[PDB]
Ligand binder design. Sequence first.
Ligand SMILES: CCCCCCCCCCCCCC(=O)CSCCNC(=O)CCNC(=O)[C@H](O)C(C)(C)COP(=O)(O)OP(=O)(O)OC[C@H]1O[C@@H](n2cnc3c(N)ncnc32)[C@H](O)[C@@H]1OP(=O)(O)O
Length: 402
Amino acid sequence: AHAFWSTQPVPQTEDETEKIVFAGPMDEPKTVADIPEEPYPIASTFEWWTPNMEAADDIHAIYELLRDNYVESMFRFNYSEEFLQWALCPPSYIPDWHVAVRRKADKKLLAFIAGVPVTLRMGTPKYMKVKAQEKGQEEEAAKYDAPRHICEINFLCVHKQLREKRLAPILIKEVTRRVNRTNVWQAVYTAGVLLPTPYASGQYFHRSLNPEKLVEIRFSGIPAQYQKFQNPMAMLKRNYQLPNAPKNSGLREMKPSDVPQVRRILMNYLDNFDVGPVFSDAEISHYLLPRDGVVFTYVVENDKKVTDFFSFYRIPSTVIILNAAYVHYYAATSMPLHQLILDLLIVAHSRGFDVCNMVEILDNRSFVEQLKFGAGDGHLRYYFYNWAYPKIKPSQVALVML
Ligand SMILES: CCCCCCCCCCCCCC(=O)CSCCNC(=O)CCNC(=O)[C@H](O)C(C)(C)COP(=O)(O)OP(=O)(O)OC[C@H]1O[C@@H](n2cnc3c(N)ncnc32)[C@H](O)[C@@H]1OP(=O)(O)O
């Protein structure tokens, strides 16, 4: 059973999503006045709290909750206060979409969920519009084509002492109410677990950058078939060896003056996909300008024209440090994508990253074999709240989730 999700405006079965023709809302429309301003009830020992992200103590409290109680044996992800700043506070973020529960008696932070604004293209997917054209339903299929200003949810976390108490449903209801008070009625979110009901699912992939280190810290092993070689580690270092420097002329760190051209080339690329974000210059600046410890972004520029760029973000892990790079956004116009991403690998390796990770969204499959990525055990599932949407392949998703 799904005692909570069965009550919510999401598709209830996979079959439901294989039969959805057009994008659009699931609930009939409501007004802001229909939504109460009183927060959702919670037990007397607890209080709702809206953290101030301009206050070092508040961001510290969030950091400590997630440090000990977020997604899980030899490694522990570390989401720094700077990383959390970055992820939670994009341009025009809404402070009360950062929703916390604290214990009244001692003010201990015990649960959290965050929404941030995103503008998303989420109209009827290409293959569904062809079926609609065939039936004279082009209009119904195109109704929701305009990019929509919605909520992206992340960092749901209930302290271990409060697990299995149905507090996550109360956090979800409360953030839903706060989003609906701003006249927003859809959200996008992801999870590594299967809930009702994803519109897309992609496997994770990894590429070792420093296999000697990975093996020493027991993050990677030496696979069975290398064990047959005379020198298994030299063969492993060989498989994954990278140049010391890239060979593409004009590759450099992205600067503020590159923002407008990066925005243009990224938006031209992301328009190719069924679901994807639309970013203003301020959002390009926020999400892509280099930020020590967090985001790394490079452009290929010559003659004052930016023709390509790539970005990756960092999530380090405590070894019970593993320095992981995650492919972020990119756009190639002057070179094959695999060469742009080779340059990403070379730069990440040079900066001391140990592994590069991605999910098979965007065109990430296109360079897997040649760049020595391997499939991993996880899948990232994409979901909408209050949005009927056909199943799509992960290569039609262009939204990277931090
Ligand atoms: C219009 C605006 C709309 C805005 C809102 C949109 C929707 C946003 C939705 C949220 C998106 C967040 C995405 C995101 O953050 C990225 S996925 C990362 C989620 N966080 C973690 O895994 C952290 C570690 N785990 C915990 O903190 C707890 O185990 C959590 C909090 C996960 C569950 O706490 P608990 O104490 O273990 O469990 P109960 O309180 O007793 O609740 C059990 C109910 O929770 C459902 N559950 C479990 N995991 C979930 C997950 N990852 N998403 C959604 N639902 C999840 C579960 O199916 C069950 O419902 P059911 O009985 O019907 O099956």
